[PDB]
């Protein structure tokens, strides 16, 4: 049962639009099974049903890191990254990271 | 050189969020080569760099129709569908349809 140790953007961060989103876990991820979806849950001034933003997901420089690369620049608003992490123990762990763009 | 004959949502339409976007061409499309990308170009009150929205593209009930299915509900704003149509004549034709959601 791997744990999300940290991320950039960090949970609850509000700032610049990220070129890539890094999720750092407590255990080495098995890439074939670990995934993420990026959704926008609000624009400034108005919440909306989650709208899936095109993104690619891959491994980073470290086996414990999952990288989400939006296909395009993220506009101002609120986003969530819904993640699934699987290590060598085979248990699928899910969670979400929420952050805001300026 | 196939032509876009019509679409739903229609070019410049402003109304409800579409469950699917249909593009109707003058010639039968070859599915392997015909494609589309859906981007959002504005929220209400603010234009922004085009942000790619996750969508699947396939053929409709008629060989002349290309269907774009957003993965999630489209929020209010302006969208463009950047399309590539290829018929049996092999010439790749591109264009864009712009519409607004309520
Ligand atoms: Cu476990
Ligand atoms: Cu939004
Ligand atoms: Cu032609
Ligand atoms: Cu927008």
Helix and strand content put the structural class of chain A at mainly beta
Helix content range of chain A: under 10%
Query: Briefly, what CATH class of chain A?
Result: Mainly Beta
Cα radius of gyration of chain A in angstroms: 13 Å
Oligomer: homodimer
User: Total helix count of chain A?
Assistant: 0
Main sheet attributes: strand count, strand direction, barrel closure of chain A: 5 strands, mixed
CATH-derived architecture of chain A: Sandwich
Estimated share of beta-strand residues of chain A: over 45%
Largest interface: A-B, 22 and 22 residues
SSE order of chain A in H/E notation? EEEEEEEEE
Q: Tell how many strands the DSSP assignment of chain A holds.
A: 9
Question: At the third CATH level, what is the topology name of chain A?
Answer: Immunoglobulin-like
Question: Which geometry of chain A do the CA atoms define?
Answer: elongated
Bound molecules: copper (II) ion
Q: What distance lies between the first and last C-alpha atoms of chain A, to the nearest angstrom?
A: 33 Å
The main sheet of chain A orders its strands as 2-9-8-4-5
Number of domains of chain A: 1
Keywords (chains A, B): Copper, Metal-binding, Periplasm, Plasmid, Signal
Subcellular location (chains A, B): Periplasm
GO molecular function, one term (chains A, B): copper ion binding
Family (chains A, B): Belongs to the CopC family.
Could you explain how this protein is built, in words?
- It is classed as electron transport(copper binding).
- The entry lists the keywords electron transport(copper binding), copper transport, copper proteins, copper dissociation constants, metal-binding, electron transport.
- It forms a dimeric assembly.
- Cu(I)Cu(II)-CopC at pH 7.5.
- Two copies of one chain form a homodimer.
- In chain A, the strands form two sheets. Chain A has a five-stranded mixed sheet with strand order 2-9-8-4-5, with no helix packed on it.
- The termini of chain A are far apart.
- The first copy, chain A, has no helices and nine strands.
- Chain A has strands spanning 4-8, 14-15, 21-25, 35-43, 46-53, 55-59, 65-70, 77-85, 93-101.
- Chain A has one domain (1-102): Immunoglobulin-like (Sandwich), CATH 2.60.40.1220.
- The site of one copper (II) ion has 3 residues of chain A, from loops.
């Amino acid at each position: 049962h791997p744990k999300l140790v940290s991320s950039t953007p960090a949970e609850g961060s509000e700032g610049a639009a990220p070129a890539k989103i890094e999720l750092h876990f407590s255990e080495n991820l098995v890439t074939q099974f670990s995934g993420a979806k990026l959704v926008m849950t609000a624009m400034p001034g108005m919440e909306h049903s989650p709208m899936a933003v095109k993104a690619a997901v891959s491994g980073g420089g470290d086996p414990k890191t999952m990288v989400i690369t939006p296909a395009s620049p993220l506009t101002a608003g609120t986003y969530k990254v819904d993640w699934r992490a699987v290590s060598s123990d085979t248990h699928p762990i899910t969670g979400s990271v929420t952050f805001k763009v300026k």
